[PDB]
Design a protein around this ligand. Structure first.
Ligand code: GTP
Ligand code: GDP
Ligand code: GDP
Ligand code: MG
Lengths: 99, 431, 437, 52, 219, 431
């Protein structure tokens, strides 16, 4: 954040949603109180690209402590859900610890 | 330094504007975060036409977004290049005027016109110089046509000399898609004749035909349709953003293509359009772009440009090219298809060459034709309107929000008068 | 002490100036920053730049010229170019709005806010000199800035500096090729308002240079740089007798006393014809007779207004290089013996010869080659009446239906001015007819 | 199935990660004709070869 | 070789292109169904009759012209101008020309209604109806008091065909024009409609008149 | 800059033309992708005869592929040098030809004819000379016969002065593999004789004989058959492509082999053609090439030229050789077999020599022979036609598809007049 008397940087909480039906990703914001900023969807459900070669973000390369770039925004993942961890361990990911 | 402020109204207008601010951000090297990850200084020298400097490095678009459904604002913010826009310039109502011209023009939508005029005034006063006002909307919806016509009327009576272009997704019957669509189109064209400085009529049916026949493309969706629309929106105003040889801005296009103060309903066209497989099996040359412009296949208006005569046709070429090749090709087009051009105008072609092509293409061009074949679209909309208005179907709404049948008769008769004027200047003799 | 002030009005004028000042710097040895190399030299003498330049004392050869365009784009790309340091920043004058191919916008509303500053810079450049030769104005008949602002500045210059000679290097519209739509309107209006304020107006046609570049230089894809370099060669050949030295000479004042018969007929043609590439430059003898015959060929005219339809009045025949004063006499004699080239009966003595020993200057990356001799012809022919007649017919076709008149009428320009321009053009029409018969 | 690639050049979408500078791109922006043609020339230094 | 334009067939060394079909902006447009003057008259009402004469006829009114309702009778008297199967054409045009000269202030309020019958007659382009309609227009503006100023909003909608047919005069040299008595010269009648508009209009009339017809100029 | 446009119609035509374009590509140093990986400058000196430039320095052949059944395009794209063709030239129908001349001529081939003429005009406008057209097809099917003849008629109507050569494949009574071959060949040679400048009759029986006895090859197959036909097709235009001492283009050959207008049915011939065991016993000289050209077993058509009179003989010699040796080998064969040459035409051999031999071939020679012995094929097809036309067998398909028995009778009559003209010029005397 530039030119503000209250902070010089901000952290906006983010919940990702990976839909396995079509390998799509939607980002959502949990609407924190008194934020004063328009919170809401911030990226709807689509197939988000991964490389410049046309590859898209799959679930085979999404883990606990990683950075994922979507549209110039570099989100960093913190923790999973219980069903998601069970499914990911069933498919064979290592699930390298919540942060 | 010339600035244009851009506006999108309705769901179709907002989607077209989102694709437009994706396409020209790709042209100008703008990150969806907002930063300049560009390569050339010419990419930044005239970025102020559509953008505005934000302290920190961001480039805020000079765009104003209008609807009465907040879901449209949520969708355009959650689209790609969605965080680009400033959230103040997201003025919306709550009722959802939603395919009702009366609701979008006289009732509760008209409680939003003062606020959108305030925000447009604020965005317009922060300019050293001003060219005009850009609008994207569809004529078959309540917010696109109702608040669209109201906004054009208000901004025209406030700023009388700054020019104004609207991009007018005009209805087609083969896509149908809305019952009160002829009513909305007839009530919008009445104001667009008198208020709008220049307008481009665009048909979704013609876009679908282009995607099916020239682009193959299997499934085109609305992304590709809005991408062709955004391409021909970006190609018109490339002389205001990139230098080169002989160039024409929006006012030059209006002056050289409007012979009489009402014949300003144009026909867009963008023509390095080829399929994915037949892309490298091509040699981009000025004669084959001239091929692809002067073809009934590649026109984004579902009316054939052969049941009528071209009044004025302008082409904005883009690429490092030969002016002899440009003039020779279009002069050859005039001489050989001399029957399809009006003979009381000796040269019916305006050329504007900008040497900086869109990224990825060596060569491109944008077609804008002022044909007398727009009377086909206007006659088909008028005949649908009089078919519905002979039995007064779907009129209890539009008289419940407080209009009169005299307004409908006046709008129908004005569109008929415009059709008669196009017919007169089509069939007018040499001397 | 001789000085020529250049004014470059419009995009065409500014690009032609970008060609011609490059040619001047290359032929005088001035580097793009402004200084002489000071380690090498090309040799012209201590004073063979004063017609177009000035010395600041430090060694900065700031040039002349009052580069002006209403739109910012071409002026700022010139400012951000190779010759950024050469030009004085106050010389390059620009505005915000564009005249947008409107004579009314160039002459009545948008031009008048910048006329005063352009005139002040012109006054400063005129006070900077000692003896002013003339005003070299580069523009197009075209539309907007080059049509309206050029005429307004011409009126102001006629009011202020009445006796100084004016040259009007102008891009005349082609017969069949055209770019703008209201180009006939702008052409007729700028002709009407340059008739009483011109001194001599040179015509250049883009389509004719296109065909000449195709036929001679053998290029099928020429851009505006390949045309503006030829126009640079024209202006250099015309005013090289002021700068360099040689045989029988000419300054800007003889170009109206030996080329303008009546104070209406001041539109000579331009014909440079050693137009040859490096592939065929050394395989043929470029003798004086050959180049003058090729100059009187109608295919080498840069107007495409074929002179066999009319008769020649005067021909200012400028020679540049290893030209013999008897060889030019033999060439003119053997062409006056020809019966295809026709001269009017009241001008037996129809030539004005001027010879310089300076060879022509090539541009690196240019299309022309190094030649021993060059010929530039300024021919005032009656054949241009057919070009006036064609633009008259175009004006009649547009003005009969009153197409594109609402812009001019609604922003300035009471309606009678269109008929004024049309009537003065018709007066010029049968003026040409009466001086031809 | 509501989002495809662009129909003009059919170039795939990008994640817009600026890990490489903006000059390093596969679709660069064009250059002006006056800049490409009107270029600074090279003077004859003197220590060249004798021409035939 | 015959070819349709703007294609590879259109560009050949021996091919010629087909001319576009005309839109017919100078042709007649006869009605597919008769007006409300053939439905309301032979059904009854209309207190008018022929009294026979030689020039034309005269309309004998069985009620006072000045007292009858112009809000009812007048706009649907103008509906009878668009036909020709005449016993009706005299009943239309002389009814117009009589009620107008023998009205008064009553013409001005019904003017906003008095547009759709006029324009519909104008958008038929019959060469004998159109002159009658123009002669009606020359008498509307001279008929009442402050009447040529209420038409100024509707200069938009009474002038789309006068633009088309103002150049409809004949180039017949020094031949005597014997059709000067029966005033049926459209290219002239349009001119005396326009100068009457300028004379009995207001002051912002001319900006709209030039907005409509491009080659008109101040009288 | 003389360019000739290739058309390949039918399964036989496409399979011959794929091998022809493979031979042309690896003779001009073109990879399957299209990039010039060649060595000499002569490979690009006259590349514009068969190839068109694209972006990236890639050469696309100036050919169109025509068929009704879509699987042959899949076969062509399956073949090597299949991706080099432009995808817009793949003009394919959807249903089947039906081995029916009427179906290929008066119906759905006649509905695809507008699109194939559109692409032919598109590929012919990209020329500066347009020397002529070549077409590859067979007289056995519906697309090869009927659609090919319709293409010939439309091309002759459009471009009347340009030359047309068709490498037509004629049926054989020994090979057959079709019961409507007499009908198809009889109906197609009627259009061939009246709208083609020159045509080459190739017989599958003769191809198999060449593959079995001059080549001693165990399994010949259509690949080697089309290899021989493609070598002939290259050799007739190598004088156009590569430089040589004596130049003879298609118009040269047409004027030197056609005495009377409906006498343009030639039989071709290629030399050298040797087996594996005959490579040792091979004196690589001009005389064995001349003898293998003039041998009756080496003819590419089933006709025995000893049963007739050689009107004209054209000899295209590719390679490094003399002029005295070539002229004396053309002289001596005439002097000894003067009985097989017409006595009312002296010195009836045309001789051309191209300096460039084909790749992997030290010397080569294309024989073309206009003789009166060609009438054996027309006699065979005419009597096979009338044998099954006397009882109107298989005629219900054609008549219900839309032809006429009058058309059948007139085609047979024109064939008989062609045979009678060949016979009268066979037995015509000098004095
Ligand atoms: N020879 C030559 N002619 C040019 C060049 N640039 C423009 N022109 C001519 O100028 C004509 C157009 O009028 P312009 O003088 O360019 O108009 P403008 O100066 O841009 O003024 P506005 O139209 O108001 O923007 C064209 O028809 C060209 O023939 C150039 O670089 N060289
Ligand atoms: N080209 C294009 N047309 C659209 C799009 N979305 C809707 N439309 C068209 O717009 C019409 C409906 O207009 P709408 O946007 O609902 O107007 P509104 O109700 O005032 O918001 C439909 O007939 C669609 O064909 C889009 O994304 N692109
Ligand atoms: N030499 C040769 N002949 C072929 C080839 N393919 C087919 N033929 C002959 O062509 C005839 C069939 O014609 P066809 O191609 O099916 O005609 P279509 O049905 O119109 O496509 C058969 O009798 C074959 O002998 C080939 O690759 N080479
Ligand atoms: Mg300009």
């Amino acid at each position: 954040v530039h030119e503000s008397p209250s902070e010089y940087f901000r952290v906006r909480p983010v919940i990702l949603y990976y839909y396995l039906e079509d390998d799509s990703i939607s980002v959502i914001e949990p609407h924190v109180e008194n934020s004063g900023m328009p919170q809401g969807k911030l990226i709807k459900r689509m197939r988000l690209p991964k490389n410049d070669q046309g590859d898209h973000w799959h679930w085979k390369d999404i883990n606990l402590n990683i950075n994922v770039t979507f549209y110039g925004k570099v989100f960093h993942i913190t923790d999973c859900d219980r069903w998601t961890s069970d499914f990911m361990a069933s498919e064979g990911i290592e699930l390298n610890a919540p942060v | 330094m010339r600035e244009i402020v851009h506006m999108q109204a309705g769901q179709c207008g907002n989607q077209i504007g989102a694709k437009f601010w994706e396409v020209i951000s790709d042209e100008h090297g703008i990150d969806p975060t907002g930063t300049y990850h560009g390569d050339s200084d010419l990419q930044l020298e005239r970025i102020n036409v559509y953008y505005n400097e934000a302290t920190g490095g961001k480039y805020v678009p000079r765009a104003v977004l209008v609807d009465l459904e907040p879901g449209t604002m949520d969708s355009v913010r959650s689209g790609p290049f969605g965080q680009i826009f400033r959230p103040d310039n997201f003025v919306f109502g709550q009722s959802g005027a939603g395919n009702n011209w009366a609701k979008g023009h006289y009732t509760e939508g008209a409680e939003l016109v003062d606020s959108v005029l305030d925000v447009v005034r604020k965005e317009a006063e922060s300019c050293d110089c001003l060219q005009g006002f850009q609008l994207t909307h569809s004529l078959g919806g309540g917010t696109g046509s109702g608040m669209g016509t109201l906004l054009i009327s208000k901004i025209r009576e406030e700023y009388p000399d700054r020019i104004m272009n609207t991009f007018s997704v005009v209805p087609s019957p083969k896509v149908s898609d809305t019952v009160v669509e002829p009513y909305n189109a007839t009530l919008s064209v009445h104001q667009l004749v008198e208020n709008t400085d220049e307008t481009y009529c665009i048909d979704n049916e013609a876009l679908y035909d282009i995607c099916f026949r020239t682009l193959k493309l299997t499934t085109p969706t609305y992304g590709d349709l809005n991408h062709l629309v955004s391409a021909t929106m970006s190609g018109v105003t490339t002389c205001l953003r990139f230098p080169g040889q002989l160039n024409a801005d929006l006012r030059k296009l209006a002056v050289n293509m409007v012979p009489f103060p009402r014949l300003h309903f144009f026909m867009p066209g963008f023509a390095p359009l080829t399929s994915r497989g037949s892309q490298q099996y091509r040699a981009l040359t000025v004669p084959e772009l001239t091929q692809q412009m002067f073809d009934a296949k590649n026109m984004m208006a579902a009316c054939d440009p052969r049941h009528g005569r071209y009044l004025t046709v302008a082409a904005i070429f883009r690429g490092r090219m030969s002016m002899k090749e440009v003039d020779e090709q279009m002069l050859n087009v005039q001489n050989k298809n001399s029957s399809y051009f009006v003979e009381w105008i000796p040269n019916n072609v305006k050329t504007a060459v900008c040497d900086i092509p869109p990224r990825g293409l060596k060569m491109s061009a944008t077609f804008i034709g002022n044909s007398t074949a727009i009377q086909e679209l206007f006659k088909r909309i008028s005949e649908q309107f009089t078919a519905m208005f002979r039995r007064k179907a779907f009129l209890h709404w539009y008289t419940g929000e407080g209009m009169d049948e005299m307004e409908f008769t006046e709008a129908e008769s004005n569109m008929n008068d415009l059709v008669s004027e196009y017919q007169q200047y089509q069939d007018a003799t040499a001397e | 002490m001789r000085e020529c002030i250049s004014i470059h009005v419009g995009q065409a004028g500014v690009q032609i100036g970008n060609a011609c000042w490059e040619l001047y710097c290359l032929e005088h040895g001035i580097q793009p920053d402004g200084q002489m190399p000071s380690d090498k030299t090309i040799g012209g003498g201590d004073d063979s730049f004063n017609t177009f330049f000035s010395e600041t004392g430090a060694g900065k050869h700031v040039p002349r010229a009052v580069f002006v365009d209403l739109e910012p784009t071409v002026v700022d790309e010139v400012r951000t170019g190779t010759y950024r340091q050469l030009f004085h920043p106050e010389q390059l004058i620009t505005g915000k709005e564009d005249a947008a191919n409107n004579y009314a916008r160039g002459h009545y509303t948008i031009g008048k806010e910048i006329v005063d500053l352009v005139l002040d810079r012109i006054r400063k450049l005129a006070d900077q000199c000692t003896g002013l030769q003339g005003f070299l104005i580069f523009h197009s008949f075209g539309g907007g800035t080059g049509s309206g602002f050029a005429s307004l500045l011409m009126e102001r210059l006629s009011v202020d500096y009445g006796k100084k000679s004016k040259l009007e290097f102008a891009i005349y519209p082609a017969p069949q090729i055209s770019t703008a739509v209201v180009e006939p309107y702008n052409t007729i209006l700028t002709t009407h308002t340059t008739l009483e304020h011109s001194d001599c107006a040179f015509m250049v046609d883009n389509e004719a240079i296109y065909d000449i570049c195709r036929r001679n230089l053998d290029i099928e894809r020429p851009t505006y740089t390949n045309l503006n370099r030829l126009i640079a060669q024209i202006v250099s050949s015309i005013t090289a007798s002021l700068r360099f030295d040689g045989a029988l000479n000419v300054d800007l004042t003889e170009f109206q006393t030996n080329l303008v018969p009546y104070p209406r007929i001041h539109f000579p043609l331009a014909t440079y014809a050693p137009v040859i590439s490096a592939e065929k430059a050394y395989h043929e003898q470029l003798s004086v007779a050959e180049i003058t015959n090729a100059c009187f060929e109608p295919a080498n005219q840069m107007v495409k207004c074929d002179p066999r339809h009319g008769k020649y009045m005067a021909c200012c025949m400028l020679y540049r290089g290893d030209v013999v004063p008897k060889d030019v006499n033999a060439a003119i004699a053997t062409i006056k013996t020809k019966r295809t080239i026709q001269f009017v009966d009241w001008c037996p003595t129809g030539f004005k010869v001027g010879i310089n020993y300076q060879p022509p200057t090539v541009v690196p990356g240019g299309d022309l080659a190094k030649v021993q001799r060059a010929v530039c012809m300024l021919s005032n022919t009656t054949a241009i009446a057919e070009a006036w007649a064609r633009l008259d017919h175009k004006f009649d076709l547009m003005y009969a239906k009153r197409a594109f008149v609402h812009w001019y009428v609604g922003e300035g320009m009471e309606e009678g001015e269109f008929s004024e321009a049309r009537e003065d053009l018709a007066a010029l029409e049968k003026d040409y007819e009466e001086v031809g018969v | 199935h509501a989002y495809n690639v662009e129909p003009i050049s059919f170039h795939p979408g990008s994640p817009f990660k600026n890990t490489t500078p903006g000059t390093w791109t596969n679709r660069p922006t064009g250059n002006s004709i006056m800049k490409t043609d009107f270029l600074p020339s090279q003077q004859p230094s003197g220590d060249e070869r004798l021409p035939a | 070789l015959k070819a349709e334009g703007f294609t590879t067939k259109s560009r050949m060394k021996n091919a010629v292109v087909v001319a576009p079909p005309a839109a017919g902006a100078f042709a007649e447009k006869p009605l597919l169904q008769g007006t409300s003057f053939r439905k309301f008259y032979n059904r009854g009402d209309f207190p008018i009759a022929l009294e026979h004469d030689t020039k034309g006829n005269k309309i004998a009114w069985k009620v006072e012209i000045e007292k009858l309702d112009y809000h009812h009778y007048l706009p649907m008297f103008f509906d009878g101008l668009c036909e020709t199967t005449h016993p009706y054409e005299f009943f239309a045009r002389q009814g117009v020309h009589d009620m107008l000269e023998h009205g008064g202030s009553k013409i001005l309020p019904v003017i906003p209604q008095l547009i759709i019958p006029i324009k519909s007659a104008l958008n038929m382009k019959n060469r004998m109806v159109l002159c009658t309609t123009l002669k009606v227009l020359q008498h509307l503006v001279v008929s009442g008091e402050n009447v040529g100023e209420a038409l100024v909003p509707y200069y938009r909608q009474i002038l789309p065909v006068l633009n088309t047919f103002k150049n409809n005069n004949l180039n017949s040299g020094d031949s005597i024009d014997y059709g000067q008595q029966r005033r049926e010269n459209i290219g002239d009648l349009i001119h005396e409609v326009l100068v009457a508009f300028e004379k009995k209009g207001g002051d912002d009339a001319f900006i709209n008149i030039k907005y409509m017809v491009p080659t008109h100029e101040s009288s």
